[PDB]
Amino acid sequence: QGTNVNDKVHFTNIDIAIDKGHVNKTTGNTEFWATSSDVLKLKANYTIDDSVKEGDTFTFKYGQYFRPGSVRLPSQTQNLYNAQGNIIAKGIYDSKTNTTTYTFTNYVDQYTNVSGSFEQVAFAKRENATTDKTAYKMEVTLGNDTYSKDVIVDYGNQKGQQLISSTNYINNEDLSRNMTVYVNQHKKTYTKETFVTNLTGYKFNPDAKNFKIYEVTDQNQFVDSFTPDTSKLKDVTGQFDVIYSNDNKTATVDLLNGQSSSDKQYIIQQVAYPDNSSTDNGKIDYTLETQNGKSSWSNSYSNVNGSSTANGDQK
Amino acid sequence: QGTNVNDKVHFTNIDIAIDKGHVNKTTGNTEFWATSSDVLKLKANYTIDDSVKEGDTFTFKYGQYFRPGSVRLPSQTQNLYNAQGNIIAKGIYDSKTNTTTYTFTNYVDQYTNVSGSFEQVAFAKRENATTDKTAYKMEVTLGNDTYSKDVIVDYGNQKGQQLISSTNYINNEDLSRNMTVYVNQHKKTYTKETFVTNLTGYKFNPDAKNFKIYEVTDQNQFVDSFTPDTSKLKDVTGQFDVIYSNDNKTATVDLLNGQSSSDKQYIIQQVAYPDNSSTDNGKIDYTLETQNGKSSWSNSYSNVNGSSTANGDQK
């Protein structure tokens, strides 16, 4: 009962593809533009040996640079279906081990000569696949069958920009946007440095204590993937006053923080929660006001479903 | 009751954008590649005059070349929401008049100073926006506020191909693929002409009488949009023998049809139904076997969700 049957579930035609992929003007390669709506697609065929029984298990093990999901983190639930639309294997995905463990239903005792296929949306493990225009080996083991493919990733980090942001990830359970903002990558000096975030369709939760400010101590902390390793970083959150306003849709912080000038470099992380469950569409707008003027970077969320919103004053 | 309040619902910042759009390498323009996953996005802000009351109506009227929806036809249901996630206007889209009529709830009596916005996925009206690399004026009237934007469409009709297919539309209610296949656009002569369709993840319904063969009598009838006008066409369906096999996943037709040779040109339409409701992913493969060898064209469906299937022999 619970027997591991990795050796009895046989995968063929394993493939990782970039969907849709962006062709690099100069090199001619198709790349994975992770911040331009590309995803990875993992596909395979499989057969199940007849001796497999109800409750037998098998695993999908994903590698260092590869995981299921998209910008949105994968569900803990991962199921496989039959052509009738019924679940035949119930899977639990563990992020810590980057592994899904599937358990067969009674389908495998009710049916013989089973063959199937799947297609799964997949992505870079951003905390490891860190750097723009760099090939990373995307690896997976389905049962005991291994496959790998090199994928060139680009996240578009423009290291000359004084303000640049990206979605780090979307939470699968609450659809919150988990943001990463890079301030001062090019190491200028400022004598005014007001950082404002304005949310459309989202709100901050100040009580959740998830607006975090890290002082960079090494340029290589700014990973191109916008998924820095917050355990390497200097947390200075408590030194700053983050002021909320506009129904928790605006956050303002004086990054000078009582100094007359600063050449400090920052990684800022934030969590923005959709207004309601009818949509997660919206926009997050960043501005940085310095002595030289204002820089801006925005992040828009517009799905293929459409949406609408409205507000008014109750009488 | 039921007062038309088009004059009392005011739209601003109306926009139609191509999402994502494709840049034409030669011309430099951003184009709507309708068969390469682009859609249109209609956006606007609005305000509601306070005198509007429950049951008051307003329209969105779409133009000759523009409609809501995507490759998938729009729902008859079109709602507007507030930031709490509640419906504030219940809409009915009529394809015949290309108009949505919205009815306000009691939100517009219980609230004052209402403003809002929407974002709607939209598309070409393919029966009218027929031709590749052609600008079509995409027009809409929201209330009494009109807007238009020229959009260059491309469907990728390669007129030199002896066989080419496209999705005409996806049915919104049953997710069927409604396909258009062009045979012999360049008008060659054949002495073998076997046309086969193979479905993966879909089945034909032979009983439904929706596999149609039209004999082209004017090159113009091949519209690049793959949405020909079947009223201008010569229906020859009943002359041909369409042979179903492989669990209604394969259809085979001898297009020579008892002649020794043929230079006829054909438009073929078909309807392919998903195996189940858990997904509509899958593929349709077409081949044409002539004296010269075999031509093939395929259409794949791979959503951002993932899917899986399987089949076996019930014990």
Ligand SMILES: [Mg+2]
């Ligand atoms: Mg068995």
Ligand SMILES: [Mg+2]
């Ligand atoms: Mg009113």
